[PDB]
């Protein structure tokens, strides 16, 4: 109930301020950026549960899989780099 | 179908402890050594026989042997324990890290006026063997009997009688 109260309060305050305000008187580069950001945000999604995965017993396995993730992500980055995907010189 | 079976209200009626979390936590490490047998017996009943309605005779003994512990504590050495759990209840996670010297007071007092030593790290978190007259339950899941598997054919293999018998294909 408390979170609801706080957010409602903030919204009310914002709308009140903005009411008083009135009542007183194509390039593919950006698309490629968005796509790269998708492919890294999903990696964040696959990477966030490490604070719970590092509590397990299969440490030799979590080590492995996390290294796989990071390594192949770096390789994809390097390839997008070599292929001039981070240049901006139209 | 099948009338469920429950126990009456006269029973499952016992003198509860009415004592609070900080108190049970300040007294746990000693309550885990003392009053351990009658606790393991109950935590074996409740797991072998999956029904709780078949371990009330043991839960009552748990409550009794816990009240006896908290009564020994009151008879002898009440003030160190009182201050210890009052200091514990201040925190939110009820942590043992801040109340370390009042804990030493409680421990010395109990070790002098009684014979309780504090379990060392890891001693309570093991799997002990418990003994009792109670028998092990056969069919605890009420495992309805299994069927019979399809009778398996068996016999030395021999080639096909006249081949594939596909239209007019001799072999």
């Amino acid at each position: 109930m408390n979170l609801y109260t706080v957010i409602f309060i903030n919204i009310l305050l914002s709308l009140t301020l903005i009411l008083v305000a009135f009542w007183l008187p194509f390039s593919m580069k950006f698309f490629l950026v968005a796509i790269t950001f998708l492919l890294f945000d999903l990696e964040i999604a696959l990477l966030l549960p490490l604070p719970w995965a590092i509590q397990t017993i299969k440490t030799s396995t979590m080590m492995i899989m996390a290294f796989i993730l990071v390594t192949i992500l770096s390789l994809g980055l390097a390839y997008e780099w070599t292929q001039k995907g981070l240049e901006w010189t139209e | 179908p099948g009338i469920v079976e429950l126990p009456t209200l006269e029973e499952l009626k016992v003198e509860e402890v009415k004592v609070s979390s900080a108190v049970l936590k300040a007294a746990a490490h000693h309550y885990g050594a003392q009053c351990d047998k009658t606790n393991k017996e109950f935590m074996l009943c409740r797991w072998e026989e999956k029904d709780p309605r078949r371990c009330l005779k043991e839960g009552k003994l748990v409550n009794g042997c816990a009240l006896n512990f908290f009564r020994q504590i009151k008879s002898h050495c009440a003030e160190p324990f009182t201050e210890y759990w009052t200091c514990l209840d201040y925190s939110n996670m009820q942590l043992f890290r801040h109340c370390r010297q009042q804990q030493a007071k409680f421990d010395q007092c109990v070790l002098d006026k009684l014979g309780w030593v504090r379990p060392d790290l890891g001693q309570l978190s093991k799997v002990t063997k418990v003994k009792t007259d109670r028998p092990l339950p056969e069919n605890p899941y009420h495992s309805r009997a299994r069927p019979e598997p399809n009778p398996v054919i068996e016999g030395d293999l021999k080639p096909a009688k006249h081949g594939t018998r596909f239209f007019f294909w001799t072999v």
């Binding site: - | 509860e16 899941y141 495992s143 069927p147």
Partner: protein, 104 residues
């Protein structure tokens, strides 16, 4: 499956977390563990045509413990009769249902 290379190499990529009676991380039990265990153990070895008819009591138990339609209906019938009685003035709730008692 269609190509039992998994069973060929005697490994497990996808066939250890299929159903509820499987292994959970910290031994945490699932809801219908026992019912599903019984259904599987009783249908093992007679697969399909037989298990759909001579292993049906256990499937009914699993269905009920997972979907709970019958329990819902029971509680709803009870509450409907109780509402009718209260409306007509032939029954009053007790204290522990009304909201006051001595708790444990």
């Amino acid at each position: 499956p269609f190509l039992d290379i998994q069973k060929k190499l005697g490994i497990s990529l996808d066939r250890h977390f299929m159903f509820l009676s499987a292994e959970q991380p910290y031994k945490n039990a699932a809801r219908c563990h026992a019912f599903e265990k019984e259904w599987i153990e009783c249908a093992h070895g007679i697969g399909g045509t037989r298990a759909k008819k001579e292993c049906k009591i256990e499937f009914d138990d699993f269905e009920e413990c997972l979907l709970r339609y019958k329990t819902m209906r029971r509680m709803h019938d009870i509450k409907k009769q109780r509402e009718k009685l209260m409306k007509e003035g032939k029954y009053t709730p007790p204290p522990h249902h009304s909201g006051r008692e001595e708790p444990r």
